[PDB]
Amino acid sequence: GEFAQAVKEYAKAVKEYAYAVKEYAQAVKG
Amino acid sequence: GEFAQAVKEYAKAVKEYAYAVKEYAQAVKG
Amino acid sequence: GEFAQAVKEYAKAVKEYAYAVKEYAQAVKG
Amino acid sequence: GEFAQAVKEYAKAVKEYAYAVKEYAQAVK
Amino acid sequence: GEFAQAVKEYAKAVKEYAYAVKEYAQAVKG
Amino acid sequence: GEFAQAVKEYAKAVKEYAYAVKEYAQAVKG
Numbered sequence: 001g002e003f004a005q006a007v008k009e010y011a012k013a014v015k016e017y018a019y020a021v022k023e024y025a026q027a028v029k030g
Numbered sequence: 031g032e033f034a035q036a037v038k039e040y041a042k043a044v045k046e047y048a049y050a051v052k053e054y055a056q057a058v059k060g
Numbered sequence: 061g062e063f064a065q066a067v068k069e070y071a072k073a074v075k076e077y078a079y080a081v082k083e084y085a086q087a088v089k090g
Numbered sequence: 091g092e093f094a095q096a097v098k099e100y101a102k103a104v105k106e107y108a109y110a111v112k113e114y115a116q117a118v119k
Numbered sequence: 120g121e122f123a124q125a126v127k128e129y130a131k132a133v134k135e136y137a138y139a140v141k142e143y144a145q146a147v148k149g
Numbered sequence: 150g151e152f153a154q155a156v157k158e159y160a161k162a163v164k165e166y167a168y169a170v171k172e173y174a175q176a177v178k179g
Contacts, residue, residue, distance in 0.1 A: 003126075006094040007055040010133070013101040014048040017140075020108035021041040024147075027115035029034035033087070036080030043073030050066030057063070067129075067155035074136075074162035081169035088176035096130040096137070103137040103144070110144035125153040132160040139167040146174040 002091060002094055004055065004058045006097050007051065007058050009094075009101060010097045011048060011051040011055045013097065013104045014044060014051050016108065017104040018041060018045040018048050020104065020111050021037060021044050023108075023115060024111045025034055025037035025041050027111060027118060028037050029031075030115075030119055033080060033084040036077060036084075040073060040077040040080075043070060043077075047066060047070040047073075050063060050070075054063040054066075061151070064151040064155040067152070067159050071155070071159040071162040074159070074166050078162065078165040078169040081166070081173050085169070085172040085176040088173070092130040093126050093133070096133040099137040100133050100140075103140040107140050107144045107147075110147040114147050121150075121153060125156050128153070128160060129156045132156065132163045135160070135167060136163045139163065139170045142167075142170045142174060146170065146177050149177075
């Protein structure tokens with residue numbers, strides 16, 4: 001069940017990363 | 031100006047990838 | 061199938077962001 | 091198993107990025 | 120098989136991306 | 150098939166991003 005768990009963990013980290021890149025976009029402009 | 035737009039475009043692409051990883055995690059679990 | 065096209069589309073976005081990061085670095089050096 | 095190890099390294103980097111971005115968004119404002 | 124080998128190549132890429140993101144985080148701090 | 154090809158495109162893009170980050174890091178260092 002290791003691969004499905006890994007892909008679930010990856011989806012969560014990519015989602016978090018999208019929020020940080022969105023915050024960086026806001027920071028670079030301000 | 032131009033770099034902040036590029037960060038904003040990348041943030042959109044990471045969010046789209048996050049939804050595809052989440053869909054793939056569900057497909058593997060199947 | 062479906063995830064493979066998502067990974068191709070994400071790769072194109074990472075390429076584009078890389079190009080923009082380099083352009084922004086050249087802007088700092090300029 | 092290799093992919094699980096890669097995801098752990100990615101999860102750790104995303105947390106470090108998100109903290110440096112938060113601090114930066116302060117350094118400016 | 121071919122899928123296990125592709126997932127190992129994907130693992131290597133995700134790991135390489137991690138290490139680049141850590142470098143970018145350090146640059147944003149100093 | 151298409152997943153192995155997608156991973157190869159992703160791995161090439163990651164390496165372009167890693168080079169770009171080093172250029173930005175060097176610019177910020179003076």
